[PDB]
Amino acid sequence: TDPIMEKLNSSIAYDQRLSEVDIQGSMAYAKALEKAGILTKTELEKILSGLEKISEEWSKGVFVVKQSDEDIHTANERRLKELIGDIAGKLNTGRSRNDQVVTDLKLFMKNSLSIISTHLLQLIKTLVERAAIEIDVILPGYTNLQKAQPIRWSQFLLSHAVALTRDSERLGEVKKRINVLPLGSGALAGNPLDIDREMLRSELEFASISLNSMDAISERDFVVEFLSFATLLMIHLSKMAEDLIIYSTSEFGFLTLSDAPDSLELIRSKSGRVFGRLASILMVLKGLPSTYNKDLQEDKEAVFDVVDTLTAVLQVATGVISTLQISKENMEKALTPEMLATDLALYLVRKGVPFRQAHTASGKAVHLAETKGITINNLSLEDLKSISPQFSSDVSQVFNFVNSVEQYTALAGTAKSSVTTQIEQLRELMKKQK
Amino acid sequence: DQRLSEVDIQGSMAYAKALEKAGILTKTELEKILSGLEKISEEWSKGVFVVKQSDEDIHTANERRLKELIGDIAGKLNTGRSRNDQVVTDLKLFMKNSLSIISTHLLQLIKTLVERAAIEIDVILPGYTNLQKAQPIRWSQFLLSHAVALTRDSERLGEVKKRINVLPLGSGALAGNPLDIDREMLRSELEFASISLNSMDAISERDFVVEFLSFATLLMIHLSKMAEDLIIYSTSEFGFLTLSDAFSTNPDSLELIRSKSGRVFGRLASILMVLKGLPSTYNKDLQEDKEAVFDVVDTLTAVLQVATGVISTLQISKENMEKALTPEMLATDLALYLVRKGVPFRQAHTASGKAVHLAETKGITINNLSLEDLKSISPQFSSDVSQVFNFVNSVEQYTALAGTAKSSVTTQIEQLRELMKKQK
Amino acid sequence: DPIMEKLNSSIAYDQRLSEVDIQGSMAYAKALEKAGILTKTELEKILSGLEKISEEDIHTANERRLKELIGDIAGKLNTGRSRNDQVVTDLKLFMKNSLSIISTHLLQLIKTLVERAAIEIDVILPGYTNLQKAQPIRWSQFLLSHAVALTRDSERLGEVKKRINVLPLGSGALAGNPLDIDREMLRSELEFASISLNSMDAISERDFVVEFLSFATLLMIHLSKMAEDLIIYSTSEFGFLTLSPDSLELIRSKSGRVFGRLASILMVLKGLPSTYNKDLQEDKEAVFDVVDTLTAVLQVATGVISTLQISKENMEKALTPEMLATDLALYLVRKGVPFRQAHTASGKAVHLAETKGITINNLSLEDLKSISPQFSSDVSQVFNFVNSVEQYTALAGTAKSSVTTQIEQLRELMKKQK
Amino acid sequence: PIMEKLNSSIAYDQRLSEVDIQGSMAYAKALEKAGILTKTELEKILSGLEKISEEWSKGVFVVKQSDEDIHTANERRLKELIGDIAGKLNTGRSRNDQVVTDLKLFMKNSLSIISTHLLQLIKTLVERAAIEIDVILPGYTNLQKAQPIRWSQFLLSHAVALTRDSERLGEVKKRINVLPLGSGALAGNPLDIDREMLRSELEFASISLNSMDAISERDFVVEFLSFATLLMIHLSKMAEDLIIYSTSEFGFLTLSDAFSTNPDSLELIRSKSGRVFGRLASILMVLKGLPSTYNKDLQEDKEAVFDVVDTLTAVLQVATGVISTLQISKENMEKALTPEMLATDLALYLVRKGVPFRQAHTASGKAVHLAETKGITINNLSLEDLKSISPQFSSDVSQVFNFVNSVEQYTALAGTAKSSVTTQIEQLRELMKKQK
């Protein structure tokens, strides 16, 4: 009576990409039905063959949807009907859309997450592979967007690599809980025909099966975990984009991007988009009583969008990180003797000069250059040697940026030895994540 | 003025022994510090301290304290160290301990549900779909569905504690530690599993905070769902069960649990926005992490225990649960009856539909229909069809894994017990 | 490569901005003529072409079918006009139109609730607190409570519509229109109420989008609550009413969908520097989805309210004597007994009752006086649900006089908000 | 014990002590008029309430572990000051219509304080825009120098966004200024209490239209949060602009030692956007799904509001100071201005000569290409170098390479031209005042 409601439950529009997983679900169920005694070796063949046909149709868009197809489910159950005959009805025996729609989603997500996984590690591998050939480049490090202290351009690219490797790790943990068979849970209390679930697992290639039908029917944990996985990933990409946006300014002049688009902006904007899907599903799920509820239908559109977003955005990021051109001279140009004010105290420290008792001489020399109109390195022992009995003719080495970075040899530091170690550590993480 | 203190002291003791191995300190100094710090941990576990107001972060409350206990020697304690890698070290140690507290309570809740399902394994009540009676299920199938979702929260918690259990200390301000400090020693002292791979990341990253909140948010969703169910079942209308009174006030205990969901979610949304737009490396913004962490930790700890209490002390009304079962609900089982006799899917329900009508037409339920009546709808109906109109039998059709048959339930209980054991 | 360009392909979902786009162009064209950048003839040219387009990204689409229709003359149309102020003019014009539609749907829902409250004013059922029977209330009081909340959404709707009804066209890329274009003429042509104050603000702000979404989410909150109530009252256990599917679940599920949009835009905006940034392109999809969601949901809600069937029988059956315990206490309060003395006197009547295994309305006058000699024989007027509800005459209460008065304050509000 | 600790609210709802007392005084008065209280009783209760009012003011009031919430604490207090008589105060009242009456009184007052601070910030922006009206700096798009603009056109774009926030604040305050008291538990007040009298005493504009709604809704809380969040988006954006601008790289400005503790103050402001957004999200999820009427879930409103009220109140004053005491560098903002940025103005030059928009830029770009292959800038090309591309190029073309003239092209309302900037200041000046 209400053309509004009908359209509201109309999903065939965006849901069709599940055509394949919906088909492989029926084939699997059919086979189990024959063993369950509901289907004969003969009927099964007729059914599989019909399902194989419709399958090959989509692979060529040849398929044709009618104006009566509510969703991908019926669209096939229909074509299958008008193909092998009324013997098409035996296939839906004992099954429900409740465990059929969740089977479809995890299969789809398990497939999609493999795609994403590939692109993600490719990105990490680009950052890492770039941090290896530009390991000598040095530029400013920031704290509240203010030149802090000297660091290697490579320590920068790897910091994003490390954050991203953790996303790959979370992805894997999410993929494992998704790789569990929900089919066979029926509409609520389970499958009433003593169907062979282990067989379904095998055919559908899941790693294991759902423990409780009610939970397997109502939980969307796998959707939320995924969205939260995707969201944290986006936070990382927007952080990277933010720095690249800043460095690519005229004012910074640190680097330039390829192309002939505004790609970095896109990457940053998608974090909100993705975040919106997380918030959406969490509120849809909050307050719902057991077991199955119409509300759970909002999961699809969210999964689809984030799936395509991460896929397009990851590849774009790889491109950027592989074609952007840095300016070693401008990154060096940015370095200043002021930044060496930190190491300055460190000189006294090794000489035995205690903490604060060493950081005092640091500021003194500064306000003094702010007095003699020079940079802390232009001074001399005909002075500094006064600010502290500790300034042999070797303190001169302190005013060298390469030596500055080389101080951080400890694990995780910016020294070339610490970086190289990181890169080897990252090749290990990847060689394992696979 | 409380929590981050004890881990802070431990953070200094470890960096001290390590500062001593770097040459910055001597056995004398090390002893006078590692004895004064221990002297401070000694006070808090009593109730002495709290002073002035120039001391911003608890760090200074402690740092500026040393000058008293010993003197200007304490200054060296921060040699090479930064407040940036020092604050994250405090947080991870805090969360590591908290996660342990929480895990204990979580597993207790799960066991409370598992243990209760085993004892009431015979009780039967209606299962719901869009809140309408759909079909008979065992009360234990209900309890176990929650317990299952909760074991996944435990798995997530474990995955989160793992990445939190990594030493960030030694990263300094952003480029690393300048004195070639021995981070391996720090790890051993503080007892982390491994050490951070990159200084800049370890300083700025707040992945560990997001994950924890994301873990806490899904746990609360699960908790708000159980609460919703019990609130509904505890209404007069349903009359399925009542709360012990200690958790009542009006099942306040349930409303509380459910309301905490948004509270916790707000924190997740909060930290995600603080991080969203931010260039590397450290930024003052990251300070908003602590209050968010502290709040979710106390909420989870309290909420989990209230939940355990409710589940173990609520009284079910087996009577009303069984009086809720109607013949109406066995219409599908009737169609299933024929299906096991070769009757096709469509015709099966078709026939069953007539049944409901033949009785819908008269003044009796489908279980009062005689063999004569059913036969006028399908010669496949035998006198044994009467075994359909038995709720015990209804539930016993689901023998396939995950189903509500008695055997499947006992299988689940055994699997969950393994799961809990695994959770250690 | 189609992996990055694909993302900027804002054409498959915003073709609905075709009409509003052409109007901005017609209007800008006229202004561009008075500015002298276009000859009187060059005007009829770059306008008769737009004439056909409407008769049949979206910008390029029209900015393409235009040149290939009137020749190269159409090129002078972009003179002094940036996409930044053109895209913002499109959304604002589009949202205004969508808000009038939405307002009409919202008004219909409110009117169906009020109208239903008028006719079913004699129905009484349990009022809940923590989903536990609290005090007897009129079914109409329940309906007017949702209607009242919805009237606040309509009020919020107008407040947002006002700030949206401001002309953004003419702000240029960011510093403004360089050709001293007559914005008053642009305003009148396009029908805005006034024009933007600062060009930078007009190019980069998306307040109007955040405001719309905040209005939409709160509105969805109100709708998900009404639905939740109707989901519970329609359960077999409650049996208060039946709907003439899963419409209720459908309405409730849309709250999160809309909340998601609010959350995403807020996150997209946070931390962006001035002035314009590509990121802002995410506003469209979110606005389109929420406009369709509200348009459909509101109408589905209206249907539900007018066609659901209540059960006067079950609703009254649900009224138990225990719900009148407070009324019992209030019986003494009106006699003169202090607050505490009465409520405890009522507490012992409920005790003395459960003891004997009866309901409080069955206690004999004798048994009551052993609890308080203040219980005259008139105490029987208390165990009456119409009398219970009729105690609440004070404005806003559930007494019949208050309900009728509410229906009138609302009847005037609907009139106001329109 | 855990349950009791988690169910308790006394610990934080203490701030409502005064508004709670004020609420009771009003009710007490209407309760006396209703006949539930005698003239003497009223005076005793009133005097008692006044005494309790001071105990909190002087910070004397003592809390008992038995105090479950601020409402109970005060009730107990009157009891020990006037005895049994104090118990008759709650007659016909509920913690349901009482708690919301309290929250609304608190928010009306807190909103007045926020309004003051918001307007002062806007005033600070406008006053500075008037004075530094000649300063010119680059305008940005995707953080790439686009076209020149006046520093004031920049300051005002922020002032304008903030005026809309002040407008939204006024709208929220209106719906909050409604009396919820007398709604009871959910069915209304049974004693026929005079609510009109209540509105008058507590100074509300109007009264609750429906009992059930008045006790279950938190619109007023969500609106305030939506108001707060959008306001923080504006402050986070300005903070982000000032952060970039204060970098050594840009060097357009620097903060005074007072705030820039590293522009710390700016980062402190930006961070709060998420903190305020979080509260918005929580309450929205807390209400979603909640059935009619009152539910314990609604208790989460208070801590959310307190956090956002104290946050905005601190952040608004920090922002005002930052804008007031910051030091710009006219020299740098001026150097940032480059000839390349005028390439477009050069294109419009021809446009103002009957030259088609098409051949206009096609002729403009070539001017950038010509000087592109000479290692100079467009302002250095010879008059002959120009006429070559388009004889339309007169001798006055020179003037185009002047930044002041660049900004003065935008005379149309809203632009960055000076006449436009002064008009804006007058409009915003008027917007405020009409505002209040």
Ligand SMILES: N/C(=N\CCCC(N)C(=O)O)N[C@@H](CC(=O)O)C(=O)O
């Ligand atoms: N009084 C009451 N609860 C109130 C709470 C105030 C509070 N601590 C808050 O923050 O909301 N509800 C009654 C309603 C009735 O009897 O109708 C009940 O317990 O059932």
